[PDB]
Amino acid sequence: AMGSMERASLIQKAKLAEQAERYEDMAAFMKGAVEKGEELSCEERNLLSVAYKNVVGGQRAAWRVLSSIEQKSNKGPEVREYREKVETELQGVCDTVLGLLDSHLIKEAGDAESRVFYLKMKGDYYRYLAEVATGDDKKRIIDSARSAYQEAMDISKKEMPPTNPIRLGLALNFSVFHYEIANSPEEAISLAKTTFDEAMADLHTLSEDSYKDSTLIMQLLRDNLTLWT
Amino acid sequence: AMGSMERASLIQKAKLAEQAERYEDMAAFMKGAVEKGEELSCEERNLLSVAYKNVVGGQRAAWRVLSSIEQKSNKGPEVREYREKVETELQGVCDTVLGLLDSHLIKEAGDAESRVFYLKMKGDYYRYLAEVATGDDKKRIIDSARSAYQEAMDISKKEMPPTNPIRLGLALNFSVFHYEIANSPEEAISLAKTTFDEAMADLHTLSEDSYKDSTLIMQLLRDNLTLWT
Amino acid sequence: AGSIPGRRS
Amino acid sequence: AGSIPGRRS
Ligand SMILES: *Cc1ccc(S(=O)(=O)N(C)C2CCOCC2)cc1
Numbered sequence A, B: 001a002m003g004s005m006e007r008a009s010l011i012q013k014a015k016l017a018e019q020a021e022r023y024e025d026m027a028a029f030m031k032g033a034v035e036k037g038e039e040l041s042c043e044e045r046n047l048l049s050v051a052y053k054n055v056v057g058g059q060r061a062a063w064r065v066l067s068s069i070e071q072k073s074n075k076g077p078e079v080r081e082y083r084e085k086v087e088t089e090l091q092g093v094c095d096t097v098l099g100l101l102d103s104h105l106i107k108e109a110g111d112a113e114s115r116v117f118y119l120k121m122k123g124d125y126y127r128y129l130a131e132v133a134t135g136d137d138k139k140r141i142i143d144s145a146r147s148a149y150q151e152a153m154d155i156s157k158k159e160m161p162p163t164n165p166i167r168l169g170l171a172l173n174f175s176v177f178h179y180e181i182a183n184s185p186e187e188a189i190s191l192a193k194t195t196f197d198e199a200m201a202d203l204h205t206l207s208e209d210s211y212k213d214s215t216l217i218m219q220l221l222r223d224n225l226t227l228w229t
Numbered sequence C, D: 001a002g003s004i005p006g007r008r009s
């Protein structure tokens, strides 16, 4: 839909859409920018991720409200029908993001920072599919999330310092996957503890600004560990 | 789009959409319910109004962000282009609501409570059009809002007690019209003061629950008067 | 200057 | 259990 707009204009409008809290627009502008075919810079990757996390974040919040009402109900078909409609729209957004990563962001991503970023996104969007999956492919959806997070993890440990914010956020989200999706709370706790401790030991190497960036995400790891232990 | 869904199902889904904070859906369900052709009950009128106020409230907030950036800019065509896109979408929602009132909610509304409610909505949605109007029809848009609020006011004073929440909210919104759209701050202040004082003098007639309802809106009148004086 | 919130009820 | 907010930046 955005094929007649300049790449730079799509990026500019995505930033304006963020300021205006118009995340659906923001996502459509960044989809348009990806479909131009060029690789994305670090900032552009963040705009793509923020746009879709907000969109799918609202859908997930709505799905959880409707799923809760429906569980207390089982009235009429309406609560299930509406939960299903929201679910299909959420699945469609996750399929769109996965499609962008598959065509062709991941295969063109050769630096560790970009490749880890996109594989973490792939794990996250399969994770959102898994949250609403029930049937024949649910086990396969979970494995698809696991596989993406694991490849990202293997690259990040080889190529990034333990305080790198992407590496830290990948481990945080993979630990959530283990706790909430994989029914592996001990794997979740071990991953969060080891990630936290290895970052702590590397903070001495950092500037004041980078210290602030890494410690912010470390505190999210600590908040989870406090809830889980 | 909702012609194959039962009226009662549309109402039920609108309430679920409110709980899930899906106001675009909520508005589409209530539009579907209006287009069934029956009059709306008090509760159904509130669902229609809440849905559209939320939708147009988000568009207005986004328009004000973009208009502010654009005023500081006058860079490229992008900020104006995007502000225009948001404006056209806001205008389209206001035209939709005005169309529902015109076809045929107002003409079928014979009780004072329903007629005042819909005329206040008509004044509000012309007011939102006026906030973004510039050109040949702007004066006419302002007069259309004024005319709708004034007819509502004439009915409300004749048929409702001074503490009725609709009468109170109509006067609040008409005073905002005077202050923000009509460049008549003295008319705004006089209307808010007279409305407040006449409600105060009628509170003795009310039950505890109705007292809470009227005093809530009276406090909004007082907050404006504090800002304007 | 605030109008009726009117965003819940 | 909270994941990366990731809703602003
Ligand atoms: C998964 C992920 C994405 C982006 C980052 S970041 O380096 O841009 N950064 C430090 C985050 C920004 C948003 O708030 C949390 C930190 C990290 C991890």
Ligand SMILES: *Cc1ccc(S(=O)(=O)N(C)C2CCOCC2)cc1
Binding pocket: B046, B049, B120, B165, B166, B168, B169, B170, B213, B216, B217, C004, C005, C006, C007, C008, C009
């Ligand atoms: C314009 C308007 C609409 C609805 C009402 S109300 O009677 O339903 N009510 C008291 C309001 C509900 C939402 O919060 C403010 C009060 C009054 C006025």
Ligand SMILES: [Cl-]
Binding pocket: A039, A108, A109, A110, A111
């Ligand atoms: Cl490359």
Ligand SMILES: [Cl-]
Binding pocket: B039, B108, B109, B110, B111
């Ligand atoms: Cl009638």
